[PDB]
């Protein structure tokens, strides 16, 4: 009973929600479909005080009247999602792993008003979660982490830059001494020569086992959180104008994606037949049987969470698991035999692959599996 429950977190969220003051009866917006994006923007960004946006949504597409408020609302959220999350506009780009999932584009600053647009996006997302509606957008895991104001760590780089991720993993596990590495970008490792110092005089100082974490931190800051800082802060600003920051920290990153993008169920047999196996794992192998038994018995949220750990997101592409993409090119969902039983299973999002040991019992496999889907670090 000391274990996390998503539905409980959700209803608690709801009860804590709807504590507010001086909200009018409704929020009026008249839009034309083709023009929706630029139509919504100046409307929503045009409010005197953000609280108005919390009122029941009254939306009318192209002057159409009388329709069910829920229908027109969810339709609008869908359309406007389709518009915002298109990389065409230059605001967002695709993750290293895998494809459809989005991360912010560091070059979004090309359009000088980009920050305003990010703030707008935050606002409408806030409306989506506030009114209990659904965003069709899906984001890189560190996005959700940054929303919760949580520390960004090496593994989080996995879905940002593959090269950076692998490089920094190697520099983590292996001793940098023999490579004469300094506190500056290394084109040998990172494939780009702009090379500039992370710390003053950095070129002269040598990275060691001692200076490891400092260097990694600086690199992570400069590559990701620094250039993305303004955009993300605008998003969080617009979003927190609706949903309280202290409030949502109830959720971890996965459950948060489940909050914004919603959670559906997942076709099991589909996922099963489209699953590929490695290192001598038959579908008839005992450990595999047990695995799918476990996946079958666990609820929706747990399955989706496992998906989030393996694929890198909660979204299964429409029309099956066969269309599943990862890293560079299309990759099915794969399970590989690795390591000894006392070790926990690991995951690789680039390959959409789950490595698990030959557990000798279904009980053991179960316990280890949930211990994997429930992330408690050590």
Name the H helices within 298-334: 300-310
- Domain identity same for 222 and 311: no
Provide the 3-class DSSP secondary structure of residue 203.
coil
- Domain identity same for 270 and 258: no
Task: Determine the Cα–Cα distance for residues 155 and 143; give it in Å rounded to an integer.
Answer: 13
44: enclosing H helix or E strand? helix 36-44
Task: Determine the Cα–Cα distance for residues 370 and 45; give it in Å rounded to an integer.
Answer: 44
Specify whether the CB–CB gap between 98 and 352 falls below 8 A: yes
- Domain identity same for 126 and 2: yes
Task: Determine the Cα–Cα distance for residues 190 and 220; give it in Å rounded to an integer.
Answer: 12
211 contact partners, CB below 8 Å, separation of at least 6: 183, 205
For 356, phi and psi rounded to 5 degrees? Answer: -135, 145
For position 337, which CATH number holds?
Answer: 3.30.2410.10
Straight-line distance from the first to the last Cα atom of the chain, in angstroms, rounded to the nearest whole number: 22
Length of the chain: 378
Angle at 227 between CA 226 and CA 231, to 5 degrees: 105
Angle at 16 between CA 257 and CA 250, to 5 degrees: 40
Annotated active-site residue 351? The verdict is no
- Domain identity same for 106 and 154: no
- Domain identity same for 104 and 114: yes
Specify whether the CB–CB gap between 47 and 29 falls below 8 A: no
The angle that helices 162-173 and 212-220 make with each other, rounded to 10 degrees, is 170
- Domain identity same for 132 and 42: yes
> Which is nearest to 307 in space by CA: 246, 342, 261?
261
Specify whether the CB–CB gap between 26 and 55 falls below 8 A: yes
Resolution for this model in angstroms, one decimal place?
Answer: 3.0
Six-digit token pair at 4? 């996390």
* Of 216, 248, 263, the domain-final residue: 263
Angle at 168 between CA 350 and CA 277, to 5 degrees: 25
- Domain identity same for 52 and 20: yes
Residues forming beta bridges with residue 182, ordered by sequence position: 206
94 contact partners, CB below 8 Å, separation of at least 6: 87, 100, 101, 102, 103
Specify whether the CB–CB gap between 227 and 106 falls below 8 A: yes
Q: Which of 259, 307, 350, 356 is an active site residue?
A: 350
Peptide bond preceding 98 in cis form (omega within 30 of 0) = yes
- Domain identity same for 369 and 268: yes
Task: Determine the Cα–Cα distance for residues 120 and 135; give it in Å rounded to an integer.
Answer: 14
DSSP secondary-structure letter at 175? -
Q: What is the DSSP pairing of strand 329-330 with strand 333-337?
A: unpaired
Residue 82 domain boundaries: 1-149+228-263
For position 193, which CATH number holds?
Answer: 3.30.2160.10
Residues forming beta bridges with residue 278, ordered by sequence position: 336
Specify whether the CB–CB gap between 119 and 84 falls below 8 A: no
Q: What is the DSSP pairing of strand 333-337 with strand 56-61?
A: unpaired
Give the rounded distance of the alpha carbon of 129 from its chain centre: 16
Strand segments, DSSP code E, in 32-156 are 56-61, 92-94, 102-104
Six-digit token pair at 189? 């490792």
Specify whether the CB–CB gap between 287 and 359 falls below 8 A: yes
* Of 227, 254, 272, the domain-final residue: 227
- Domain identity same for 223 and 239: no
Specify whether the CB–CB gap between 130 and 66 falls below 8 A: no
Task: Determine the Cα–Cα distance for residues 200 and 205; give it in Å rounded to an integer.
Answer: 9
* Tokens 């109830």 sit on residue: 250
Number of H helices, E strands in the chain: 15, 10
- Domain identity same for 190 and 241: no
The Cα diameter of the chain in Å comes to 73
- Domain identity same for 259 and 331: no
* Of 205, 240, 263, the domain-final residue: 263
- Structurally, the chain folds into a number of domains equal to 3
In the PDB record, what is the listed experimental method?
X-ray
Task: Determine the Cα–Cα distance for residues 243 and 199; give it in Å rounded to an integer.
Answer: 38
253 contact partners, CB below 8 Å, separation of at least 6: 141, 144, 145, 147, 148, 150
Provide the 3-class DSSP secondary structure of residue 277.
strand
Specify whether the CB–CB gap between 54 and 24 falls below 8 A: no
């Amino acid at each position: 009973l000391g274990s996390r429950d998503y539905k409980r977190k959700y209803e608690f969220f709801r009860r804590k929600l709807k504590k507010q003051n001086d909200i009018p009866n409704k929020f009026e917006m008249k839009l034309r479909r083709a023009t929706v994006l630029e139509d919504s923007y100046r409307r929503i960004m045009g409010v005197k005080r953000a609280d108005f946006l919390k009122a029941r949504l009254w939306i009318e597409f192209d002057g159409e009247k009388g329709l069910d408020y829920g229908g027109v609302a969810r339709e609008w959220f869908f359309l406007i999602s389709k518009e915002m999350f298109n990389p065409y506009y230059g605001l967002f780009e695709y993750s290293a792993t895998d494809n459809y999932t989005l991360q912010i584009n560091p070059n979004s600053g090309i359009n000088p008003d980009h920050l305003s647009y990010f703030k707008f996006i935050g606002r409408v997302a806030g409306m989506a979660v506030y009114h209990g509606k659904l965003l069709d957008g899906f984001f890189i895991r560190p996005f959700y982490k940054m929303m919760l104001h949580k520390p960004i760590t090496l593994h989080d780089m996995e879905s940002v830059d593959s090269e950076y991720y692998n490089s920094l993993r190697w520099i983590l596990e292996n001793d940098p001494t023999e490579l004469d590495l300094r506190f500056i970008i290394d084109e040998e490792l990172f494939g780009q020569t702009h090379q500039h110092e992370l710390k003053n005089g950095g070129s002269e100082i040598v990275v060691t086992n001692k200076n490891k974490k400092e260097y990694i931190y600086l690199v992570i800051q400069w590559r990701f959180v620094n250039r993305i800082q303004k955009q993300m802060a605008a998003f969080k600003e617009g979003f927190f104008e609706l949903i309280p920051q202290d409030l949502i920290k109830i959720f971890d990153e996965n459950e948060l994606e489940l909050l914004m993008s919603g959670l559906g169920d997942v076709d099991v047999n589909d996922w099963r037949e489209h699953t590929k196996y490695k290192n001598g794992y038959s579908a008839n192998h005992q450990v595999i049987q047990w695995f799918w038994k476990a996946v079958l018995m666990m609820d929706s949220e747990k399955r989706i969470r496992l998906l989030q750990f393996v694929t890198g997101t909660s979204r299964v592409p429409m029309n099956g698991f066969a269309e599943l993409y990862g890293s560079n090119g299309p990759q099915s969902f794969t399970v590989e035999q690795w390591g000894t039983p006392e070790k926990l299973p690991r995951a690789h999002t680039c390959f959409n692959r789950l490595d698990l040991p030959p557990y000798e019992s279904f009980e053991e496999l179960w316990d280890k599996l949930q211990m994997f889907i429930e992330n408690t670090q050590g």
